[PDB]
Symmetry: D2
Subunit: 452 residues, 4 copies
Amino acid sequence: LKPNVKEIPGPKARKVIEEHHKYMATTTNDPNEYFLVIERAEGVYWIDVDGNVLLDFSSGIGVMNVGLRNPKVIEAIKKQLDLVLHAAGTDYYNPYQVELAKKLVEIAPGDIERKVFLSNSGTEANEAALKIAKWSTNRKMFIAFIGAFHGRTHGTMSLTASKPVQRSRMFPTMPGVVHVPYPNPYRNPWGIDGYENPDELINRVIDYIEEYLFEHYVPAEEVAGIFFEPIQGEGGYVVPPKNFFKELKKLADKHGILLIDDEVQMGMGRTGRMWAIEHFDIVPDIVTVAKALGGGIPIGATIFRADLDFGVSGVHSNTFGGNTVAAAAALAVIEELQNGLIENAQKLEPLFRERLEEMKEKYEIIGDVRGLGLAWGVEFVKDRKTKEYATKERGEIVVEALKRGLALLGCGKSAIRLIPPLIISEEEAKMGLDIFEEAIKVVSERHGYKIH
Amino acid sequence: LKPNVKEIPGPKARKVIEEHHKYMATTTNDPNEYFLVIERAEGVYWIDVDGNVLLDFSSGIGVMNVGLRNPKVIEAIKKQLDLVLHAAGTDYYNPYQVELAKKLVEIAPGDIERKVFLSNSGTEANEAALKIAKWSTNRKMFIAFIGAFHGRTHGTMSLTASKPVQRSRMFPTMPGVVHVPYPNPYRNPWGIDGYENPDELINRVIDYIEEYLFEHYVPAEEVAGIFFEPIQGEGGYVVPPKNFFKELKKLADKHGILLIDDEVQMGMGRTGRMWAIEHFDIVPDIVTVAKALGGGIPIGATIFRADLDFGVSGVHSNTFGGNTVAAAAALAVIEELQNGLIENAQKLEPLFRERLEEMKEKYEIIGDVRGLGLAWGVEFVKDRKTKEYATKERGEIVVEALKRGLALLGCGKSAIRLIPPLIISEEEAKMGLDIFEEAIKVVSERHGYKIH
Amino acid sequence: LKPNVKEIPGPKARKVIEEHHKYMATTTNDPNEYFLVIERAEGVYWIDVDGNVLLDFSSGIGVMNVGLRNPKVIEAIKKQLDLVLHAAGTDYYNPYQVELAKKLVEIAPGDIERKVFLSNSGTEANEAALKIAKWSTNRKMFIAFIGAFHGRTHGTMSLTASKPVQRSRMFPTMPGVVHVPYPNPYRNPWGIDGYENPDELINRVIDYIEEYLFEHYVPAEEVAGIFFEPIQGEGGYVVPPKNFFKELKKLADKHGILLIDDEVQMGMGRTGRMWAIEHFDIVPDIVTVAKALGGGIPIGATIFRADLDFGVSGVHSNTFGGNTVAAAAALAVIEELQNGLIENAQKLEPLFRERLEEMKEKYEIIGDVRGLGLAWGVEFVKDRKTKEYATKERGEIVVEALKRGLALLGCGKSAIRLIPPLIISEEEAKMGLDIFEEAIKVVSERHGYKIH
Amino acid sequence: LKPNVKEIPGPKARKVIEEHHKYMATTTNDPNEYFLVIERAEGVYWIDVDGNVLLDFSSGIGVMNVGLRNPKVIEAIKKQLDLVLHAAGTDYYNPYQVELAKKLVEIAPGDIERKVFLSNSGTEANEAALKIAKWSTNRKMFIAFIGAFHGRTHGTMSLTASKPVQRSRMFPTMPGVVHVPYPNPYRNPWGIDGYENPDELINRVIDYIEEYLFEHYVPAEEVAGIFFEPIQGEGGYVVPPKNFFKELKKLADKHGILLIDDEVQMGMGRTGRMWAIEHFDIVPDIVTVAKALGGGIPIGATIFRADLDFGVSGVHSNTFGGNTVAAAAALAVIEELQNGLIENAQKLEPLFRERLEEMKEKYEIIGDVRGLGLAWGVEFVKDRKTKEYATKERGEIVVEALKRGLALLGCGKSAIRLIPPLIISEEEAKMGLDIFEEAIKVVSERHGYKIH
Ligand SMILES: Cc1ncc(COP(=O)(O)O)c(CN[C@@H](CCC(=O)O)C(=O)O)c1O
Ligand SMILES: Cc1ncc(COP(=O)(O)O)c(CN[C@@H](CCC(=O)O)C(=O)O)c1O
Ligand SMILES: Cc1ncc(COP(=O)(O)O)c(CN[C@@H](CCC(=O)O)C(=O)O)c1O
Ligand SMILES: Cc1ncc(COP(=O)(O)O)c(CN[C@@H](CCC(=O)O)C(=O)O)c1O
């Protein structure tokens, strides 16, 4: 199996795309932009409906970090289909979910007292995390960061501030969320070159929260929780300065406010550590996780400081959570991660770092490259000084990449996210990076961007 | 397999129950009322970790309608595991999510243009129904029923109204929900015997909404929707009057207000019909479903009039939506309902109708029996005139039923829900009712309730 | 002065009514129901711009309790105009605001520690009661009564529940208000004759709050207050059962919930007692007042248990609060109430009780008469059994009353409020009732209502 | 009458301050900081209870712009006491309120179609302005600026973001308000010297709204209204760059969003023009006004684009609004303003400008002076580079000023506002400025601030 795409969209793929519009809601699908109709997968390759074969650099939106069809994960589901699928894990008990909870507690950030709530997705996780914070603190408000994307349900909508379309005629969602600039070292309201000047940018963010919220309109003692992603994912895959969460805890702790680390995307080994937050050297009180945890099965988890746990029964619960198939799959994923995959993403870090700083130098359309492990984001600006978003160009590059057999996804207004399965070999990476470049190169020539 | 219980909880179950309290959040588990620790299942029975075997009348909180381990479903899954698990349905198209989506619209109540938004759970369904209701109507408010349960996320909790604990310390949740008395024929504020006088109670519930909301504090034309359960799942299995939803649509259409019907529990032919609402001869604008459709797999589904689809991309989306594994399970589950299982639930309806009216005639502790198909709800009262809840007694029956090999669920303050798998045989249905009557009989004697 | 009307509206009034529609916002003026253009006043009568003279039974919407132009009040003002008008009471202290504040606590219902927050109006009073309730209890929610009116600011409108138009296009207003049926003896959802069966109706209204809010969707211990009018001013002058507020305090104390009584209309001895609540033998934690206390001057006053005072400075404040001109008028107004005017309203109560029961016996259009002191409310019904509002007819009576020299106010959908100044003589009280009966009689004949 | 204070607080003033604490709510009073107990006034002098005489530089918190006891204003109230005090100006009509409305429309900013709503205070005005905006646009959200102070009621609380104490345990207030930095040329999150670099600062504010709200979490088409004060008053009396509202309209108009100019403090001639906004060369759609409009009587007005008016009756109204005494007083104030006072504040502008830039040069404790007409704010910083607030020093200066006979008020965290009556002579000003300096001088020596 090598990349091989004779034509796309194919007659079969064209018929699915017609049908999908007949019977399915307008979500985030894009007929022209993302005409990829998957029928099966193998290793790091999607096999489409018309037979075209594409190297994967999307990993099912980060859902698959172990691979697109992990053997150990399908054996674990098969083995768990034999005993029990569902055991109402919130009314009755079952050991599988307890085995997962104990494992999740174990691998949590830091070395502190933890408990675990189970969910079916990242939005449910972050909904959980909200209630848990509301209950334990008896405070009702929350800080999130502009660019953050925590979900699409009425709690997480409030928290999510990536695209105003997300909240189109949704107002009002859950009250008490206030937003401040994320320390985005490429776009922040201060013009600050956050790579050259990280402490200057860290300070401006903190100084905003302290001086322009707490001192004016936000009672600091009324804030349950600060919600952050350790790398904004949907927000264009943004890496904030190394010493940012350390400075943020300092300010959190000074007003007895919870830190909530949304690792729905950047967790499960993606950045060459179990959790994204470790690189930033802080122990979050609540850690939410989903996507990659279920290795292709729907699963969500909320990991928290044990003393934050719900006083009484019937505050929160869910029928679906605690499903055995998902828990069987999860334990297996975490085993795959600990036994090779997490080391592999640290191994391929310097390869994506060199090859993308190569592309930075050469293609003037690229404004910024950034990432950790196998979590990368290239943002494409029309003009480097102006930093205007090349949204149209980004779409063209993805389409071009798809034509050449590379599967990519667009995060943010003007960037593309490289997130292959953590199983990818050195020879499968160089292939993706080679294809990716050739996509930029074509679209660069097409529009008269310099090529140094 | 037969029912076969020695010590429950046995020594392995006691160890699991301990481990659960240590690692896992405080939810709706009860070591003292629901001490059932499930290792595996076959046919209609649970096998616990000590090897005790119990007849199922809980059906995993109405999720295993097709059986606790259906052969058709597990084969449909394992076939799909050979192809692909997750395929980024929100961003990329696959045929499986389309087939399921297409299938769902076809089986939907009435005969009108429908589309479908795939979700991960009941709450993730009703959350979606909210946003569809909001976006389509460009109205922000909803009506809901006291006694209703629609999920535990910041949207749905405004909608939910079963127990205050559910909303404890959560305010504010989503604004704009106003609630009103569900036409419970047994408990309503007007005292009305709703079984005897079903029109009088319908008028009252309607009179309230028109005269007390619409004429005083709730602008009719600013209401985006009315969420109702056709039978309240966590409300004690309250069955409304047959002409209720008819009267409620007369009112709804008069002000352009969408009627949303929640079938997360009573759906998938639980009541002897594919959709619970069908018994009531009305067509809802939205239908939400989860639980049973997945058939042991987490699944979500919001079915709506094509008119209400979001005009633009990026209003609502989800990473796990349209799971191919889940879609494969769902289609298999649907076939079984149409090819035997729905018929079997019409067939066994009279048995329960008989045996549970035999039980009310005999045991004074039983205030009201009610149900359709294989959805039954016995409510237990201290006195038949004052109707004080027999909460302590209801919990004892559940514990007694369990020491005699019957998995039962509480539902409401003082009632028990009988919801066996729709694959249950006549002989297995009698066996479980026998054991159910015995558990009432024990707890009746113990407390000196009358036995006629 | 006598009543004396020729053309109303006369040619100067028509010119003013035109100028008003041109320069001024669309509020609660009605050229077609309230075409009364006031130039000056003396004693108990209005003189209009054409020199038509009308007997007053409106009392400036219950503001001129002491008369339309009281000598004592105007002297108290002009004496204060010689000293100072505004003195920055919020920031600087003056003796006048303290004297009035001290005076207000002394006259307050019951005998407990009280303080006072001076405001500018009824809404600015109840807004204050909210913040005092919130700050003191550290609870965010309130209960209120369907039919209630408490003002038209973003706090109070949640509290208010008289007409939807009041809340049209305003959502969201302040969250956390839940409403319930006021124990109207004439119109309630249970049908109960509350005059006949006042306990049955009290139980119902109480049963609703306990069983339908506190037991299902409203955590009792998260309710900061219950706002009630002792008689609903814009609700058609509905007089609740005498033992109602007693039962409601039993419940309120059981959950630590402040009972707030609004006397913005029924206060200042309107009902023959200084405070309207007094008739009901309970002591409210907060008492709000405005209108009549000012005596032709804008004034606001929130009276509360000393326990609930804000711990810190800068939570609540207002620039115009504690106006010295207004305080001088208020003290003068209070003296009159205690030195003649409250007595005069007890004295004239039987007259209205007679004449309006004589009118109900005679005119079939009259569904219900009700009132205390000099607060009377006739409600007009199409039919006495169906109780459909006689809205069109009620408006005609007001117009007929006015062509015969009687200023009257609508109140509720189909009723009229009789609220003359408390300086009204027995002879002036008979005259206005005679004219009132005549206006009913005309509109009865015109529409073929029965005359017994 | 000259400044003359032998001792303060006096034995009489000490007794009032004791009593005030017995019977009055904790608001913004400060026993130690503002021990000024007014008994009467004359010209520009307060006469305290113990006989001490103080030149006024507070003007009753900006309430008196015509003087502390204007003759023309007391003659107008006296003349209006004779005819009518209250005439329920929202139910019935009266020419006085129409005469005021017509006058207010006339003197409004720009030359456009206007209507007028009447209120009792600035909070009611801004509550009005909210509803009017909500109704006309059918949008529910609003932008205000950090530092803004629009009121203390549940709508205006949301809008007000000056001190977090203001919102202490108040959450939730009205949803949908979002806040952005005010272009404060001395403190903004960008460090921008707004006097040297106004366009750079204007852009950063606009660029924040456009790029960090509209493009991320705030749908621009869902924003009814941008609320601004043309000089932040309570926020330390801050003058934003001359071309700021012009750039803000540009952005407003591009998304069909209303501009709401809160002139409650800076209006009624205070800045040497009728309205503060004129200096900034834009025509606001809604203009709110109170305080100075009533010349010592409680009055509020909301002036708006006529096509924004309430479609239907009963959306908004108030019992108090339209009071004749206040309207009589208002017309008189506006006459005083147009016939000398507004020219006088333009005359004394260069005198406060020179004498305060004198004080800037000499006293290192002064960080910034700023203002227009007779609206001035001196902010005192501990260190000029650091800009730390000298809150304690500010209190000392006010107390010191009070001791020497000068009446001042503290606006913001570390500044004092000079706002004498517009009637003040050149010789009464130099006196105030002389006293003010001597207060700074003393406190400067006391603490070892340089004196150049
Ligand atoms: C922080 C965060 N929260 C929630 C989710 C997904 O919530 P679910 O509960 O699984 O529905 C994601 C996935 N990030 C995706 C989200 C795409 C979308 O929701 O449209 C991304 O890569 O943008 C996420 O990164
Ligand atoms: C109407 C409705 N909505 C939502 C849900 C659950 O949403 P999920 O997304 O599947 O979690 C249920 C299940 N009713 C269960 C609820 C159990 C609980 O949450 O405590 C019941 O029958 O008690 C339901 O009946
Ligand atoms: C309980 C209550 N609160 C507040 C108010 C009015 O607050 P203000 O601040 O004095 O405006 C009223 C007056 N009831 C009037 C209301 C008129 C109206 O606003 O339309 C009435 O009798 O209709 C009232 O009864
Ligand atoms: C913008 C604005 N809104 C409202 C008000 C006052 O609202 P009322 O309706 O009159 O109560 C003021 C007065 N500015 C004063 C406010 C002081 C205070 O409210 O504590 C000031 O100078 O700080 C104001 O400047």
